[PDB]
Amino acid sequence: VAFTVDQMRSLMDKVTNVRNMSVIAHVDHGKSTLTDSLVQRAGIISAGITIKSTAISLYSEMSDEDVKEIKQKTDGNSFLINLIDSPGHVDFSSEVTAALRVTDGALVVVDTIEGVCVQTETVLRQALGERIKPVVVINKVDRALLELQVSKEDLYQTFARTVESVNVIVSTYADEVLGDVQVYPARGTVAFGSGLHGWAFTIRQFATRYAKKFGVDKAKMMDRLWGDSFFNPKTKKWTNKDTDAEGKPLERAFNMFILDPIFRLFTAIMNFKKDEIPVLLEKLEIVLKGDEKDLEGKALLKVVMRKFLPAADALLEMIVLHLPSPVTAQAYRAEQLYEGPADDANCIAIKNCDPKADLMLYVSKMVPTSDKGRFYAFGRVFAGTVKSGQKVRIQGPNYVPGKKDDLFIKAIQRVVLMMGRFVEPIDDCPAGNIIGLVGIDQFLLKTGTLTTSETAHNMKVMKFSVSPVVQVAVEVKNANDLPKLVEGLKRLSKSDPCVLTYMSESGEHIVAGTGELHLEICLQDLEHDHAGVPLKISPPVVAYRETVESESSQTALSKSPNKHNRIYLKAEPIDEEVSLAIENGIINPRDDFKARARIMADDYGWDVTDARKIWCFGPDGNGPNLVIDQTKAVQYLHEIKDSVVAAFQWATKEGPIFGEEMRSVRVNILDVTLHADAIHRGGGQIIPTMRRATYAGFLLADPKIQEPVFLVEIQCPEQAVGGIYSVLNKKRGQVVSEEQRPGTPLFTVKAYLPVNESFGFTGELRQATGGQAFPQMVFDHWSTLGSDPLDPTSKAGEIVLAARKRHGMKEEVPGWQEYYDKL
Amino acid sequence: AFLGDGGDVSFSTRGTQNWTVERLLQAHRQLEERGYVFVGYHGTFLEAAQSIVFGGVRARSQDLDAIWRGFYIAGDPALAYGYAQDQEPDARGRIRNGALLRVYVPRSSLPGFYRTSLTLAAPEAAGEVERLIGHPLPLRLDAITGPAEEGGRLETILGWPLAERTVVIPSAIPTDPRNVGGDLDPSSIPDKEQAISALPDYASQPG
């Protein structure tokens, strides 16, 4: 249906009638199919800046009698449903949590024949740990009839077992504090149908239908239409005994009143019994129009069933009548979603879904848009009201009410509805609703908390990292498609904040990701969309760091090509603390040099004299590497500063060990001799001089390499936990902690895992746990290898040689003499 | 064509493309077979190498006294090596490694090659050079070889008219992309290129 902005806001203020929910289903189970049926039936449409579809809005209208069945506060017969997009596979764990966290209900799709698969089971655990209420739909019933050709009782028992498996999971992992959350067909919390053909039903739908033909209230009718209820055809009498007086078998009500009608349509139509179909159709009052009256086989069956039991209706009914509203759910989810005090003014405001309190908006992800390369924030208002122009406290991951770290007090350019692929600007948006924001992508990388109270803590943070720990070289197979790849990378880089595309000195096109899989999907998107050209891709390579462990053995000296200029310097390690402070914005390149020096001096033990003479950071003008001017009375020193900084940018981008970035490297310029005439100390002269002196100084300062390390968090059932440790113990894994969820038998194992040991990790963990483990890993820290990188046999040296060969460099690492002044 | 057989030759920071030592040996031989002779090396930047090898050496303005204008080369590749790089950074400050080139002349031009012990490009040597070549500077269809500086290595200046009659091909001696500004390591000079790099004997006395 098409709505105006006024209408949307109108049914957005009625948060009691909103359903924040997602669809939990395996892709091979027609997840996309059932989602389509929902959109084509209840999808909302607006009365030019497009976005990647992240959420769909649905509108459902019900009767006054229906609204009374809802066991939670309601207002009116209008209902706003937010269908939050879900990942296509479990492996995308971090974003599987992202979706669930902003949803209160979940439509869980299971299979008729295969029942509940391993992954749907795992995701359900997570959804339950998030305190999300489930409603089940048994899909692909079509197959049970057409292929297996099962009997009505056999099909019934199949559903019974399926529902049994689901509730085994539900009663085990659903939190006690939610009450009985198990699903019961007789209660209308389980639907049956076939997404393919587009039909589905609930016991309530058939109960409403027969309610009159039996002079009975809907409640006790659907109570009978499942379980051991039998309507004797001969006596016209209801019974709880599956045999009559003479000992003959009685058919249960489900089989008799629900399955039988459907079974007859399937038989009459697929057997081309042209004389039965008409009689059977009028019986159920299924009227076909013109063209439809000629169809046959599956073509006809599809139209008949679609008109008989529209799938979307059976699903919407459950979603509205049984899924919790923002009001109902936030009352028991708030404590879980707030990283602060339970009785806080803000946590309280979240339980009450208070639209008047200080803002508490959750940004679950950043969405690519058509408005330049900018990203639109996506999330949910858990408290207060978000407004266009409203100034808000952008609280990032590292934020803590104490410090002012990771804090940005900016203004919301625009508040917009995420109508699937399109954007709709609105004045404001009360608590309980899902919404998008404009002008925040430069303050938030992916997730964070927006607040208007300077005493509010972050909301349950989702750990991410932009560190490109894995990368590959991209290369067109046909040299004419080059431009298509160049624009393709420029495109790829824009569709994802955590993807990196750059050119190495040698001119190679590099794509860097946050993990094996993440980089995998990026290369697939590039070769089919962003570029669409046949590409030659080198095997995945891990990103390392080059660093020093001591001060240079001696002063590093280098001379310019024309022999008229000289730079004397020395390299020394920077403390991890300081490197962390730089990487975390505390020590800032853009900061005032005097305010910044105070911090390095007071908080980090730097001579304020040195901290005041920082010439630059690097690489990329902000890395954890520094140049310090410690020269005395050097004439025209400032006239070569731009050149020296430039050299530093290149030197720290690709170090002398094997082309890897530098980290924690301090360079002290001790002395400089220059030609009196500027004509003889331009960029061409100084740049190579500074760069070579740096390499020399580096090589003299006890060279080493650093490897990236993940922090992995694994959810897993007690039984299969043993598989976790089994895998970690052959990948230099290191257990951080092993916590158990109070009631449930769910464990959370945390461990450090070297990134170069993580290739094919989820695959192995999958097997070792029977697919019951739920992995989540983010880059945590860099680790300096003990071994000598210059030794080809040592571990660090083994890495170096392989890489140097791969790059076509001279196998052996150059000595400092190579870059030192030749004399 | 004097580049021998194989793929299209191009210049890159990764090194000269489609230019093996064996191809050089072929190109060099075929050059002598056609009456050409090696006279030294010229180091420069990539685009310059592209222009020189495929468009030929062409006269241009240079920063010195008019009387010393010409095409500068060196018999010792280590000297020419120092010029095989960008002289100016690009927008971001990138300074790329260049390429070494081998310079050949028609043997018919050898009667015009002279040497001196004096330091070239200086007013105290002009008089002696003008004596050797039998005419006032600048050089024309003649060349002068001498110390590029006091106690320094030898350089050769080809008069512009003579320079335009050169044939220039790539060297098998690579520059170092990871050590721009460094000096040429003799061990990186292919022994087989060294074997074909002897210089002609230049006259110490005028014609």
Ligand SMILES: NC(=O)c1ccc[n+]([C@@H]2O[C@H](COP(=O)([O-])OP(=O)(O)OC[C@H]3O[C@@H](n4cnc5c(N)ncnc54)[C@H](O)[C@@H]3O)[C@@H](O)[C@H]2O)c1
């Ligand atoms: N370049 C060398 O190998 C070399 C050898 C000995 C001495 N030197 C010394 O270096 C100084 C600079 O000489 P230079 O030759 O490097 O710079 P230059 O000013 O004499 O010539 C300018 C540049 O134009 C370039 N160029 C591009 N296309 C060309 C073409 N088609 N024909 C001719 N030149 C072309 C040359 O490579 C050269 O780098 C000289 O004064 C000399 O003392 C250089």
